[PDB]
């Protein structure tokens, strides 16, 4: 079935050098076996424990900026008394209201919002109780108004200086957009009374009488200092059950016991909030409601029948169909695959909607950007859905806020607004003048399985709660309609609620947070959660952090673990960054790491890459080198001003926003290493060639192999690769390593590390970089067994290599790990390392070279 052992052509000069270094370091060499039926394993090999602790809290004061977490000295507000600040801010606001007519008009829109009438009740509830829950339908105005109500209360009652609100949002798009919206509602830009703080981007508001919208991750990273100088904490959209939100509620519950002066406000959609109420000591529930219209529901049976639709040529619920429908309806529906969504039926539904002769927008719920793009392309093919008749606007996370705000804009009468949206438009935002809803009844979820390291962006069935919420979006302006694209049988076999993220998400990052914040045991703390995670996930987290040496045997945070907890990326990439610093390639490795948090900068449109994009790869057969190369080129082109940058990006077909955000992310990652004590000169930008000899890039590739482990694969032919599991898989179309057409690629090595192992119809390897066999042994393997002439790597691939070489390379890995520990104890030692460590690093540098494994990337053969 599987392939023969790969020939590894290693020179004796290098084989000796390896043995000499291992001699010099005096590392324990696992000797060869006597009989070849004895596979010998070449692999080689504290503070006191806590119990529990609470995050400290303190209220706002005048000489303290809670967003920058520092004193105010230089400014005039260092001495300024609270009363002065309060009165000045009040007078400023009063003057603005009487002068600005556009602001008056905006305030008048605010007063018509359903939540307005509950202003008094909400404010009293907050003042009387440490914790409250505000429950109400989506579109009432919980998110935008409640923080303002609270702030304007403190302003207008001459105590503006005692008000600092933190507002948490599950999404990045929400934290930014809400801040922009609230600012506009107060006649400001973000920076004055409102601000935002997400990962790798922030606009901090003023120190006094200010609202800070943020993601939960940002807030948690700041809590090691404490919740210093905050009057209110608003946790929004709790019903979505974001894992970080659920986690925060655990922390906040401990806070309100020890510090009952703080105010917590939980805000929720129309769901059963018993859980949350009971969790927070039977806190009050303030109900919020407004204008609602009855919405007529339809299902796939109904939709097919009234459109007379006919398609092309769990159990299948499209086979099941009641006998109060036509024979054509049964026959037609039975041809539809449930695992697909019927794009042509949606097209038909749009055409049916305009025969009703009632003008209004159509909100179409689709799982991900792919099915939005596919639906969008489908429509614009047909001339009927053109500029004269239709305004088709996509709404997902990965488009500029320029285009996102267009969904709220009105349209000329005669044109119908169609929004192709994700679940963002389910409970988090409310698009206006929506009369019709087409619902796919799907969700998009990350399902990660640790055993095989498989990522699945799975399209899954939504809950009854989801379908009811999506149905509710149609009836805010007038009686609406909702077209569910699931069978009436399927509806019955839907779960009532989605699985919360706490049940199905890796917990290693939350585990690091727990230890950073000194909240006690990982298992102990997560047991107190509203709905605790499964045991295996906790064990998996503990296992992951032990492998990295983030935790010691006592499960206490090591110096290395402290750095990984501070870095807002995957811990494994954090460690790779640290290794990069040791090798003086920290900038490149920080660039690689940053880019994992954002979309691909290449605008490929889901196709194979063209000439321009592939050239960036050089002769390295690497998507990561391509990334680094576009950053080198982009940074050069950016020298000549903003317009020169734009032209470069749209000439090279690059997403300029992605490159900018990634750069800024890199700067902040570097910032945190500097503070942790890493020297400046191991994090400098370093020019590199992607074609010629370059040992700096060699090391990056070696370090990349560590980061993405255990994503390794072996090329057979065309696009077929073998995974770690043993199963076969495809090269992703995006890759520079994907054959452009017929001409097969002559890879100098069959081994590739890669970013994601994606589950779809088949196993796909995305973001692929070629590595040599030596790099495989060094950084892209845990377990290796030698019989004398053949080596077995992680019980999936075999190599024909010297025993001594394999054991020496495995010893280097152990030596490097030992140094990483020593370095994290005292990071500044990389400035001047003793000769023996430099000898170890130099040998790894040599092993990272293509020529080390008898490869020459110059001669394409
Ligand atoms: N960017 C925006 N443009 C136009 N209207 C908006 C925008 N953001 C929010 N709104 C409107 O503000 C109102 C309240 O929305 P929001 O505060 O998000 O409600 P909730 O969180 O209670 O569901 C709604 O009518 C919504 O359409
Ligand atoms: Mg809301």
Residue numbers in the entry: 270 to 314, 322 to 589, 606 to 1153
What are the paper's exact sentences on this?
DHX9 [DExH-box helicase 9, also known as RNA helicase A (RHA) or nuclear DNA helicase II (NDH II); EC 3.6.4.13] is a DExH-box RNA helicase which exhibits unwinding activity for both DNA and RNA substrates. DHX9 is a large, multidomain protein whose RecA domains (RecA1 and RecA2), which are required for helicase activity, are bounded by multiple auxiliary domains; these include two RNA-binding domains (dsRBD1 and dsRBD2) and a minimal transactivation domain (MTAD) N-terminal to the helicase core, and a helicase-associated domain (HA2), an oligonucleotide/oligosaccharide-binding fold (OB) and an RGG box C-terminal to the RecA domains. DHX9 has been implicated in several biological processes, including regulation of transcription, translation, replication, RNA splicing and processing, and DNA repair. All structures were solved in the presence of the nucleotide reaction product ADP.
Because the initial efforts to crystallize human DHX9 were unsuccessful, mammalian orthologues were investigated. Dog and cat DHX9 were selected for protein production, as each was highly homologous to the human protein with sequence identities of 94.4% and 94.7% for the full-length dog and cat proteins, respectively. Interestingly, the cat and dog DHX9 constructs were found to have higher melting temperatures (dog DHX9, 58.7°C; cat DHX9, 60.6°C) than the human construct (57.4°C) and the melting temperatures of all constructs increased by 1–2°C in the presence of nucleotide and magnesium (data not shown). Crystals were obtained in the presence of ADP and Mg2+ for both cat and dog DHX9. Streak-seeding greatly improved the crystallization reproducibility and the diffraction quality of both proteins. As a result, structures were solved at 2.97 and 2.71 Å resolution for dog and cat DHX9, respectively. Both proteins crystallized in space group P43212 (one molecule per asymmetric unit) with extremely similar unit-cell constants, despite differences in pH, salt type and the amount of salt in the crystallization conditions. The second molecule in the human structure superimposes with a symmetry mate of cat DHX9 and similar packing interactions between human and cat DHX9 crystals were also observed in the extended space. Cat and dog DHX9 had 22 and 23 residue differences, respectively, from the human protein construct and many of the changes were predicted to be in surface residues.
